[PDB]
Amino acid sequence: QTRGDKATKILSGTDWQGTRVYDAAGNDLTAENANFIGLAKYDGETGFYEFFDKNTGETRGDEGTFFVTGDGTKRILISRTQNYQAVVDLTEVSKDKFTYKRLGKDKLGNDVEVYVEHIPYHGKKLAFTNGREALTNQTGKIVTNKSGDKILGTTLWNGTKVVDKNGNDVTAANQNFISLAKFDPNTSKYEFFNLQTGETRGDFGYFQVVDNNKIRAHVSIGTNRYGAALELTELNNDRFTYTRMGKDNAGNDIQVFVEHEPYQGTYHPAFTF
Ligand SMILES: [Cl-]
Ligand SMILES: [Cl-]
Ligand SMILES: [Cl-]
Ligand SMILES: [Cl-]
């Protein structure tokens, strides 16, 4: 069990409610950062979260993938309904108290570091509006009795091939998806690098393999901020493959499958963050 695994178990064990927002000195800034206060339901098994309104109990319409980094230091959210991502530094994860810090506002409207406290919620029984759906795309063995993250951590990887749903090669139509990829399971850091030059593609941040090894989720904190929760269709020491939208050889928009295998080139890329 990692420190992230321990945190995730605690987040999954109860519903939560934000209580107060404080600066480090304990000045109450809740009214100036009211939007940081709501209810939450976390399901570690499916790597899924949903937020609800503190006063009414109704969904905030914000659901998606969450995780805690392996080292226990950060929570990542990737919203599939509200088109954002967030990384926050965790300061406590205990059965009676969950706290993170981030940027907020003081009474004069200045930027300050604030701490958002939460305690267990025992009000309305909360249910996911949608939940993690079934994921049924598969192109090879998907290992489930070992940590997905640890499988990615075994080697540098590179994209080797892109195929359509019938196995037709469409790699030349999707070269933008072909990178040298580095994954660190302990820190949950990933970075993509150019295969020709060894240099970062400027796409880097935090990743985790979630949902019984069926999703690779990541958030880019680089030049172009985005997140993704990509369904894995093969995952083992020889190969991993995810599916997403791409192009066919004619330039039509189609479902594609991006295969990766352990990298055999000469580069030994370093994280640039
Ligand atoms: Cl998601
Ligand atoms: Cl393991
Ligand atoms: Cl082919
Ligand atoms: Cl394997």
3-state secondary structure 52-98: ECCCCCCEEEEEEEEEECCCCCEEEEEECCCCCEEEEEEEEEECCEE
In contact, 253 and 267? CB cutoff 8 Å: no
- Is residue 171 within 8 A of residue 162, CB to CB? The reply is yes
CATH of 133-273, one of 3.30.450.40, 2.40.128.540, 3.30.750.200, 3.40.50.300: 2.40.128.540
Q: Which residues contact residue 151 at a Cβ distance below 8 angstroms, ignoring those fewer than 6 apart?
A: 143, 209, 213, 235, 236, 237, 240
User: 223 C-alpha vs ligand 2 centroid, how far in Å?
Assistant: 33
Q: Which residue has the tokens 């929760």?
A: 229
Q: How far is CA 267 from the centre of its chain?
A: 27
**Burial annotation 99-134 (CB, 10 A radius, 16+ → b, else e):** bbbeebeeeeeeebebbbbbbebeeeebeeeeebee
The closest ligand to the CA of 171 turns out to be: 3
Q: How far, in Å, is the centroid of ligand 2 from the Cα of 142?
A: 14
CATH of domain 1-132: 2.40.128.540
Q: Is 251 exposed, middle or buried (0-12, 13-18, 19+ CB in 10 A)?
A: exposed
Backbone φ and ψ for 177, nearest 5 degrees, come out as: -85, 0
Residue 97 Cα to ligand 2 middle (Å): 28
Please name which ligand lies nearest the alpha carbon of 49. Answer: 1
Where in the chain is CATH 2.40.128.540? 1-132, 133-273
Task: HSE, CB side, 13 Å, CA atoms: give it for residue 252.
Answer: 5
Q: For residues 84 and 228, what is the distance between their CA atoms, to the nearest angstrom?
A: 10
Identify the DSSP state of 35.
G
Q: Give dist(CA 199, CA 156) in Å, integer.
A: 14
Report the structure determination method. X-ray
Ligand closest to the CA atom of residue 148 = 2
Ligand nearest to the CA of 70: 2
Q: Which ligand is nearest to the CA of 154?
A: 4
Tell me the backbone φ, ψ of residue 33, rounded to 5 degrees. Answer: -140, 45
Backbone dihedral angles phi then psi of residue 190, each to the nearest 5 degrees: -130, 155
- And the tokens for 50? 């949903």
DSSP helix, strand, coil percent of the chain (3-state; round to 5) = 10, 50, 40
Looking only at the bridges linking them, the beta strands covering 39-43 and 111-121 are: unpaired
Tokens of 255: 């479902």
What is the structure's resolution, reported in angstroms to one decimal? 1.9
Nearest ligand to residue 249 Cα: 3
Count of C-beta atoms within a 10 Å radius of residue 138: 15
Distance 89 CA to ligand 4 centre (A): 33
Alpha carbon of 46 to ligand 4 centroid (Å): 21
Cα separations (Å) of 143 from 5, 138, 169, 259?
18, 12, 25, 16
Distance (angstroms) between ligand 1 centre and the Cα of 48 equals 7
For residue 124, give the DSSP letter.
S
Query: How far away, in angstroms, is 213 Cα from ligand 2 center?
Result: 11
Instruction: Kindly write down the DSSP assignment for every residue of 169-211, as one continuous string.
Output: B-GGGGGGG--EEEEETTTTEEEEE-TTT--EEEEEEEEEEET
Residue type, 186: N
